Amino acid sequence: NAKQIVHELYNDISISKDPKYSDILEVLQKVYLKLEPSPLINRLVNYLYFTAYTNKIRFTEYQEELIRNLSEIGRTAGINGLYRADYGDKSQF
């Protein structure tokens, strides 16, 4: 469930009261409200990795796993638009 994963990712990050995650939490919040989906989910994942790189942020192994699961929900066979691979897989090129 997308809402569940977003809610869980938000809560896990929020507990570690760190200002460098303020923007990420704001975006997660915005996405959660909207979810109450594949395109939105993918835009969110794009943002998370872009932000992480640019801000030199490192998600915990568990947080990375939640992000992976979120994309899997967005990329489930025949639900939305066609996707070329699991998120980040080089097989799409």
* Structural domain spans, the chain: 1-93
1-93: CATH superfamily: Ta0600-like (1.20.1440.50)
For this entry, resolution in Å reads 1.6
DSSP string, the chain: -HHHHHHHHHHHHHTS--GGGHHHHHHHHHHHHHH--HHHHHHHHHHHHHHHHHTT----HHHHHHHHHHHHHHT-TTTSS--SSSTT-GGG-
